[model samples]
Target: KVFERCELARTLKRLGMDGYGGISLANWMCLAKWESGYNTRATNYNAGDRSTDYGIFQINSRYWCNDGKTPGAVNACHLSCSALLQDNIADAVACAKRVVRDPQGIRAWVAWRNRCQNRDVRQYVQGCGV
Candidate 1:
């Protein structure tokens, strides 16, 4: 599922991502834009760590999801990595919330830190009517 900008804004807002863990909806939007381009089925394999990033949030198999491939990985989200690839983002959203619960907060996503951190991200949702 490739979500339109406003559509994803509204969806994430409804999912309580507006300010989850002190992270704003725009920031999350920005993160997703760079991480997976709003595509639910997006995935990236990291050969260095032998881990794969899955789904809209690009949740990694190394620490978040269990893919039965990444070495010494922990299923912190307690879910199959395939769950993140579904068009319905509920499970992915829940896992994202769990990720932010950590002390690193949204910084858990290095992409967010590099692309969204301390940046003006309001433009990502400015005219979304969110």
Candidate 2:
């Protein structure tokens, strides 16, 4: 399967019916829809310069690709860049679960969405968490 669809399905599987225990699927789907339109290769040209952001989660390549830490940290790059990529949903679900379970709770995700909107990608912040 293509990377984006794989990522989306994997993300849903991770969250499970009660992955967050109480977090609604509707809420999660809401976020996913806004984030990437469920498109893994989705990119935002709103910035004028067209840059590539990858995967259903739209993780930036610069953040994950090696620049200073190592000459060619391809593995590390792939891990950070494609953290959303998975052999199965368990990994993606586990990562998201950890984020939700953090001391700050789901508020962190909300904070992230808010922060994104403040930057200019307001579209991504809409309809998140229902």
Candidate 3:
């Protein structure tokens, strides 16, 4: 489902992804905005390899989860790509943390770098009181 932005903020806040790898809550949400526009089922193509980016964080199959149909996938998270797109984001959150802690850190999320970096997302959850 495409989540209402504030609803997405509250969920992210409640889910405790606020400070993963030194990420602030606002930037996390901003990353989510660009990655999937807060849509759990969002998917995008990796033009280079034609691999898929799944879920709100747009994690790629090449280094993350297996898409089942995709061959030779690394599946670092040891999960099905579909699992990350589920309404409950437990698995996606777990996988995303691993990505953020990698040698690249939050730089793994280009959307974060391009759109979320140095931006304050406090107001996203400010009125929601999460």
Candidate 4:
């Protein structure tokens, strides 16, 4: 589901900025926009490893989740891959935080590296009034 332009900040704030997983709110919002366009059901297939990233936050099967087709999955976050695909994402937020607790931090998200980091993203949430 696509969040309304105003609804993004509202949901994120209700979910909390810690959802960023050590990144700022602006950067986090940018990551979400680029990664999944704020749709909870988003999925991305990787040709290299055939891992499908799941949900708005794009948690991956290689390390963060297991879709049951991928063998030797890390299952690091200890949740079903399907759990990340919900419109209500309290579990996803918790899993992302666990990822940051490790050394990788928010760098686990390539969207942050490629676009969100070190940019002026204040405008992304400028008038959302979160």
Number of the top TM-score candidate: 1
lDDT of 1: 0.94
* Candidate 2 lDDT trough over 10 residues, lowest sum: 64-73
The candidate scoring highest on lDDT is 1
Tell how far residue 8 is off in model 4, in angstroms. Answer: 1.9
Tell me how far the alpha carbon of residue 102 in candidate 2 is from the true structure, in angstroms, after superposition: 1.2
- The C-alpha lDDT values of all candidates are 0.94, 0.44, 0.82, 0.80
Model 2 agreement with the true structure over 52-129: per-residue lDDT tens digits? 344444433333332233333333233543445444434444445555565664444553465442344433324433
Task: Mark the 10 consecutive residues where model 1 has the least summed lDDT.
Answer: 15-24
Weakest 10 consecutive residues of candidate 4 by summed lDDT: 16-25
Tens-digit lDDT track of model 3 for 1-130: 7888778777887778888678777777777888888888999887778689999899999889988756677998999999989998878888988888789888888778787677766666667555
lDDT of 4 by residue, 46-115 (tens): 8888788998888898888878877577899999999999888778877877777888787878788898
Give the per-residue Cα lDDT of candidate 3 at 62.
88
Clashes of each: 0, 3, 0, 0
Ranking by lDDT: 1, 3, 4, 2
Query: In terms of TM-score, which candidate is stronger, 3 or 4?
Result: 4
